[PDB]
Design a protein around this ligand. Sequence first.
Ligand SMILES: Nc1ncnc2c1ncn2[C@@H]1O[C@H](COP(=O)(O)OP(=O)(O)OP(=O)(O)OC[C@H]2O[C@@H](n3cnc4c(N)ncnc43)[C@H](O)[C@@H]2O)[C@@H](O)[C@H]1O
Length: 208
Amino acid sequence: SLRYIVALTGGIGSGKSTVANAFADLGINVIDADIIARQVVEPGAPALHAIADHFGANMIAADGTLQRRALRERIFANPEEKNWLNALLHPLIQQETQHQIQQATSPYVLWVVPLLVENSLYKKANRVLVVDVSPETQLKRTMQRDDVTREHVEQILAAQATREARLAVADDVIDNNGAPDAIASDVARLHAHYLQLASQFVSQEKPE
Ligand SMILES: Nc1ncnc2c1ncn2[C@@H]1O[C@H](COP(=O)(O)OP(=O)(O)OP(=O)(O)OC[C@H]2O[C@@H](n3cnc4c(N)ncnc43)[C@H](O)[C@@H]2O)[C@@H](O)[C@H]1O
């Protein structure tokens, strides 16, 4: 069957997981790109044999599991390897993402993709939701969470797509500048629309 996909994105410290949990509370299955990336290298996964062949047998632990810290460290000391690893994992991530979307039974699925704009992944979504906050909020919340400097978070902000680049591809925008609670009402309104879009998209003769 065809699943209706709502992608969710936002920059660092915007509240992507916070908003995703509110949809999950309403019964929506959430597919998270970062969890999918960890799953393709789990014990017994196909990518593990390729990784051992490329980086060395010692990239694998005693029980057959990936020495994740050792891999992260090896790629940081060999920049070209980062690209080699992403190229190997990409198709596997695409397949696993599709598998999880097909396996979700909620009316529509919420696909949380931090790199949605950077990687042009909005092309694979039926609807795009952006959780938006000011840059100051991004900085303050990340600083509090990780106990890091303003400068450290600014560097991440400058590496990510801009706020305006995310807004330019959004169908809907949810504000998360307020406190942890205006989110429920806004999520409920969006959810009610998503249920309608999902119930009608397969037969919808004309565009919106
Ligand atoms: N590119 C990158 N480079 C380096 N580190 C990166 C990184 N991307 C992520 N991290 C690392 O992952 C953590 C969460 O990611 P994220 O900030 O992109 O996560 P989101 O899913 O957008 O956000 P949440 O985890 O939902 O919320 C983040 C923080 O804000 C708080 N928060 C959320 N809504 C709030 C609200 N309404 N009022 C006050 N605080 C709120 C949360 O408790 C949490 O401390 C970062 O702090 C950093 O450690």
